[PDB]
Amino acid sequence: QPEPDMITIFIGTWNMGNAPPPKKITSWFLSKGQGKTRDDSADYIPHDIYVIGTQEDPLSEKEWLEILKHSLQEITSVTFKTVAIHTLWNIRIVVLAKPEHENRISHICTDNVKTGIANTLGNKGAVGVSFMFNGTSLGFVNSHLTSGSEKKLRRNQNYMNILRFLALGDKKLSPFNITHRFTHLFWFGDLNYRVDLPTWEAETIIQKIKQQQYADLLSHDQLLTERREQKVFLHFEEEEITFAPTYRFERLTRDKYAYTKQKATGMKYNLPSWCDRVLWKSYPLVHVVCQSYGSTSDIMTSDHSPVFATFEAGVTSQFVSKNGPGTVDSQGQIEFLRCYATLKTKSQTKFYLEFHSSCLESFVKSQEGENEEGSEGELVVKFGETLPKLKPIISDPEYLLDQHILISIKSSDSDESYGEGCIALRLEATETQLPIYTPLTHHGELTGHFQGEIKLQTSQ
Numbered sequence: 281q282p283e284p285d286m287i288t289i290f291i292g293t294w295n296m297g298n299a300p301p302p303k304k305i306t307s308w309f310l311s312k313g314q315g316k317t318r319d320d321s322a323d324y325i326p327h328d329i330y331v332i333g334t335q336e337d338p339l340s341e342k343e344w345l346e347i348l349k350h351s352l353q354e355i356t357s358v359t360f361k362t363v364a365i366h367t368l369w370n371i372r373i374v375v376l377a378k379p380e381h382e383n384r385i386s387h388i389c390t391d392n393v394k395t396g397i398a399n400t401l402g403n404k405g406a407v408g409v410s411f412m413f414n415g416t417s418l419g420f421v422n423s424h425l426t427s428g429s430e431k432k433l434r435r436n437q438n439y440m441n442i443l444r445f446l447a448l449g450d451k452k453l454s455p456f457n458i459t460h461r462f463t464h465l466f467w468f469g470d471l472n473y474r475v476d477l478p479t480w481e482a483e484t485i486i487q488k489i490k491q492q493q494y495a496d497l498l499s500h501d502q503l504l505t506e507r508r509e510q511k512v513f514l515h516f517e518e519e520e521i522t523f524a525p526t527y528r529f530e531r532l533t534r535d536k537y538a539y540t541k542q543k544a545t546g547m548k549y550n551l552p553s554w555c556d557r558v559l560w561k562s563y564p565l566v567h568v569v570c571q572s573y574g575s576t577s578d579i580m581t582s583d584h585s586p587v588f589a590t591f592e593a594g595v596t597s598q599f600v601s602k603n604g605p606g607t608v609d610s611q612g613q614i615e616f617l618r619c620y621a622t623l624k625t626k627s628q629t630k631f632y633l634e635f636h637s638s639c640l641e642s643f644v645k646s647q648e649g650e651n652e653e654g655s656e657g658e659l660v661v662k663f664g665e666t667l668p669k670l671k672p673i674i675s676d677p678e679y680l681l682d683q684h685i686l687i688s689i690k691s692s693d694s695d696e697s698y699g700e701g702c703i704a705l706r707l708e709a710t711e712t713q714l715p716i717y718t719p720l721t722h723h724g725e726l727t728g729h730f731q732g733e734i735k736l737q738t739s740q
């Protein structure tokens with residue numbers, strides 16, 4: 281039975297509004313309702329992995345697992361295996377997989393982050409799960425960020441705290457946060473970003489939603505505007521939104537948006553908004569294709585509608601050769617030529633690089649680079665032809681061309697990372713000097729760039 285080179289992944293996010301679900305929620309897992317929906321002809325085809333994020337979830341883990349498993353069994357006639365479940369307060373993540381995947385899945389990690397301080401610590405934050413699927417690392421984050429139209433900067437701060445402090449994936453990747461640890465990272469939840477239009481325009485917005493005219497609303501969506509200004513979710517993707525705002529509904533129908541200020545809302549307006557979102561970030565040149573992104577129309581117990589997204593994702597096999605794992609394969613090598621880092625820092629320490637990859641037996645430290653002053657007042661760190669030749673464990677091009685090298689640029693004085701990035705080995709040619717490039721980030725914000733050339737030798 282062959283190992284897959286693609287899987288499909290279902291991502292669900294639902295703020296349940298502290299109410300139990302209705303008896304039937306199958307529409308969610310079938311990607312049916314509004315937006316980019318799944319074809320009816322696929323209804324019986326199970327996804328490989330289902331990742332369910334809830335917020336304001338009033339159920340026990342046991343109660344929700346029973347509902348999820350019985351839902352999927354009704355759709356697919358398959359009894360899914362529970363990979364992981366993790367709950368912080370009323371924020372929960374469940375990962376389910378087809379039984380045939382049980383011995384393909386390992387290194388399961390869970391963690392949570394509590395956001396805020398004092399007043400603002402106690403109900404917002406994130407949960408996450410990571411694991412290996414054969415040769416591919418997968419990470420999943422469900423976050424419930426700060427509410428309220430006038431708190432976009434708090435939401436951005438919540439995002440930075442979650443990506444700094446959520447401890448998932450390979451702990452040996454010490455310079456890297458979750459935005460670099462995974463082949464594929466999915467980040468979803470009630471992100472709570474609002475449509476920033478005046479309160480007086482509520483009925484106008486409602487009119488536009490009834491006409492299915494979302495363009496003048498999406499141009500004021502805080503998540504899209506903050507992402508375009510590089511304030512949050514740098515280097516993440518989101519499918520185009522083609523479904524109505526998923527908040528705030530009157531319960532037990534979808535015919536009414538409940539936007540007016542009430543004692544129950546702290547006298548805040550809740551203009552119709554796309555609070556409930558799915559974003560992703562995959563390593564360069566790995567296959568990832570969104571095949572659905574939408575909301576259900578028939579699940580009305582909450583003041584939010586459930587959101588679904590599905591993806592094709594490239595995966596690789598657990599490779600064995602005569603040589604690696606457990607030794608190098610002298611027929612393979614990675615050379616970095618004429619490399620330089622450009623950093624936004626004011627610091628004048630010397631810097632060195634670390635190269636991390638699961639194609640190496642362990643990470644590789646470079647010599648210090650040569651600092652020059654850039655024309656427009658930046659730091660340029662030159663490595664020239666001084667970088668260590670990297671010795672992969674396996675030389676087979678079917679393996680090596682699918683790998684990635686994570687790069688950290690670290691201060692010699694403090695050994696702290698000033699920037700992290702990733703280079704694909706999916707090159708146009710081997711034995712050939714080719715340009716490489718990554719942006720560098722630290723705590724998920726842009727700190728610089730790394731560019732130069734690579735020369736990859738495989739056994740072929």
Ligand SMILES: O=C(C1CC1)N1CCN(c2ccc(F)cc2)CC1
Pocket residue numbers: 361362363377381382383385386388
């Ligand atoms: O406690 C252990 C022992 C290794 C320490 N496991 C629990 C999680 N396991 C799991 C794997 C795939 C899967 F799809 C579901 C569950 C198996 C391994």
